[PDB]
Design a protein around this ligand. Structure first.
Ligand SMILES: Nc1nc2c(ncn2[C@@H]2O[C@H](COP(=O)(O)OP(=O)(O)NP(=O)(O)O)[C@@H](O)[C@H]2O)c(=O)[nH]1
Ligand SMILES: [Mg+2]
Length: 168
């Protein structure tokens, strides 16, 4: 074990749900207020998760996909993000999950369902409803806010834990 483990994480979900804001909060502890649409960006951070020192490589995606399928197939695990005030983004999750399964050609891909913007009033997606969908996929569910930092570390770390379960 002179080899440091590297985990390739990919963040997916509809446009505007907070994929970039989550990632930038994780890396630089900074909340981005401005909406700046992403094409494809990558980040890297060394962290300790359950006592294991590892390197996270994080691919932040856009919310015409020969190129997209390829960079998706590099991913070991996926954060599937929706915003709790955007019903359509929640409905889109099924489609992200199918896209992941298709490109990985696997029915068992490490994944975490993230409900973001939980600092905002007037949620349209209830906790129970998201919890139940996660249950039907057999994956964890976490409520997050890129603005307050609620759930940020826990979302990425939980996904690493799912990857470790997968590797056995
Ligand atoms: N209140 C609040 N606003 C958020 C949160 N997360 C993101 N936002 C806001 O939502 C907007 C879009 O966030 P951004 O991270 O760019 O979304 P994205 O999913 O990366 N968009 P794209 O798919 O185009 O790249 C920004 O104005 C940002 O400040 C959150 O947890 N709470
Ligand atoms: Mg973005």
């Amino acid at each position: 074990g002179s080899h440091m483990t590297e985990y390739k994480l990919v963040v997916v979900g509809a446009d505007g749900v907070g994929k970039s804001a989550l990632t930038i909060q994780l890396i630089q502890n900074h909340f981005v207020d401005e909406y700046d649409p992403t094409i494809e960006d990558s980040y890297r951070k060394q962290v300790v998760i359950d006592g294991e020192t590892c390197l996270l490589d994080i691919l932040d995606t856009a919310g015409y996909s020969a190129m997209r399928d390829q960079y998706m197939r590099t991913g070991e695990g996926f954060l599937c993000v929706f915003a709790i005030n955007n019903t359509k983004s929640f409905e889109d999750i099924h489609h992200y999950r199918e896209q992941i399964k298709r490109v990985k050609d696997s029915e068992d891909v490490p994944m975490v369902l993230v409900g973001n913007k939980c600092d905002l009033p007037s949620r349209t997606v209830d906790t129970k409803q998201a919890q139940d969908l996660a249950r039907s996929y057999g994956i964890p569910f976490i409520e997050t806010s890129a603005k307050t930092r609620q759930g940020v570390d826990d979302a990425f770390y939980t996904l690493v834990r799912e990857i470790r379960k997968h590797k056995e």
